[PDB]
Amino acid sequence: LQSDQLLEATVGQFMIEADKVAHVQVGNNLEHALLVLTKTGYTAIPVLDPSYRLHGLIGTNMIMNSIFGLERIEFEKLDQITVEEVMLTDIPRLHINDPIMKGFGMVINNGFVCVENDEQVFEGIFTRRVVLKELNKHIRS
Amino acid sequence: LEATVGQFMIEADKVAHVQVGNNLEHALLVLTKTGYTAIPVLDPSYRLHGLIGTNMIMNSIFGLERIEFEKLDQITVEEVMLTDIPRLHINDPIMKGFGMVINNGFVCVENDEQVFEGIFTRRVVLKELNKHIRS
């Protein structure tokens, strides 16, 4: 894309596709979510329902806050609590056809924003890195 | 583009941090309570030694058979922290910091004496970029 086209593009053209996005499900326990976060190295990831609709975000700091006990880390709670009981549900959302400038504005306060289609099926994520890489390339010109 | 990193950075007195010698249980508590996913590690002379984050700490105790949470207070931050990190000076042009936050959520700023001065964050960059293109 040329500079005069970039600001005319859509969020979907620059999102990380869902098949490359690490995620978990509302009904998984915190142990599984902590495993996925730790093994993928991401600090927060999408939470989907069984029909692939976005319901929230789950991150390592959220999980640790739920098991940090008075005197010890209550690791047994990882198997006893589900991610939907701990996940953040007030998250921003983008549509695949949203103008890219909307996404540029939404990553000011968010490291990534989830993207969905007309039927609320999860389509991928719109990340700061992709924005910064692209804007750098074009500013430099 | 005529601006400097020091003009837009988050000043050090606003920055959450831990110190060399603190253990990982303390660092993990600070990360969890402040909500930040990675923060600087300083020494008593306020010099920057590295960055510590929640993912690093988890990976240091996540075993094949169990998560060894009970070892957190036996490991120091310097045994786990990331040390191969970019650095900026307060007088660096903003476009230099812009390039460094492509691969880093934040980049530490220090003076010519190696004293920590603040952090240059993606949010500050994105705020300014949004202003320039929206004009």
Ligand SMILES: Nc1ncnc2c1ncn2[C@@H]1O[C@@H]2COP(=O)(O)O[C@H]3[C@@H](O)[C@H](n4cnc5c(N)ncnc54)O[C@@H]3COP(=O)(O)O[C@H]2[C@H]1O
């Ligand atoms: N494996 C890796 N290789 C190279 N660089 C890496 C990396 N993991 C993290 N980074 C760098 O660290 C930044 C922050 O990652 P974090 O996990 O806190 O925060 C991430 C994470 O919460 C989420 N994310 C990114 N890619 C993801 C994926 N494939 N699946 C699930 N979540 C993802 O979006 C946030 C922003 O990601 P963004 O790429 O803008 O920014 C990333 C990236 O620049």
Ligand SMILES: Nc1ncnc2c1ncn2[C@@H]1O[C@@H]2COP(=O)(O)O[C@H]3[C@@H](O)[C@H](n4cnc5c(N)ncnc54)O[C@@H]3COP(=O)(O)O[C@H]2[C@H]1O
């Ligand atoms: N209390 C809060 N209030 C409002 N928004 C919040 C927030 N905590 C996090 N965020 C939002 O989440 C983004 C990523 O935070 P994270 O902790 O993964 O990654 C952060 C954290 O690693 C570090 N950081 C930012 N501010 C810090 C501070 N005052 N002290 C220590 N580290 C800081 O710099 C990274 C990039 O931060 P940036 O501000 O660009 O981007 C932040 C910010 O937009």
Ligand SMILES: [Ca+2]
């Ligand atoms: Ca909201």
Ligand SMILES: [Cl-]
């Ligand atoms: Cl970030």
